């Protein structure tokens, strides 16, 4: 869905030069401040109040590759974040990625 499975040069450039799929799009980037504010509202607790002796079940939250906190219940946070993105409050090109085993 991201790059065409068929269009690639022959020869020594094979597989290194790719071609975008028709519905592909490249993100422009977006400020991370509203994301952090939404996260802070819904219940994320900071790392200055973190103690892995107690927090054995908590789910850790990364933002742009930066670990910024942990949550007691990722389910409602991902649901609300997805609803905010699908309502327009968050930029539509913002990834909201829950990992469940990790």
């Amino acid at each position: 869905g991201l790059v065409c499975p068929a269009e690639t040069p022959e020869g020594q450039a094979c597989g290194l030069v790719k071609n975008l799929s028709l519905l592909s799009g490249i993100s422009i980037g977006s400020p991370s401040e509203p994301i952090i504010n939404f996260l802070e509202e819904w219940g994320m607790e900071p790392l200055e109040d973190y103690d892995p002796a107690q927090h054995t079940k908590s789910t850790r939250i990364f933002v742009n590759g930066v670990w910024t906190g942990i949550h007691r219940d990722p389910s409602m946070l991902v649901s609300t974040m997805r609803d905010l993105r699908r309502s327009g409050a968050i930029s539509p090109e913002v990834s909201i990625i829950r990992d469940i085993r990790e």
Partner: protein
């Protein structure tokens, strides 16, 4: 069903109940600009595409 001409859409029998979250808008959109000119690209071996 039982159409000897139309291609068999895969059985998918292992899973009791599917919980889909998304659908492709159209599967031909995986191709790019140059591959989109090809008529019936699913009837060719990929090197020819």
């Amino acid at each position: 069903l039982n159409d000897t001409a139309k291609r068999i859409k895969p059985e998918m029998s292992t899973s009791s109940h599917h919980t889909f979250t998304h659908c492709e808008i159209h599967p031909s959109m995986i191709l790019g600009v140059a591959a989109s000119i090809i008529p019936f690209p699913d009837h060719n071996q990929s090197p020819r595409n």
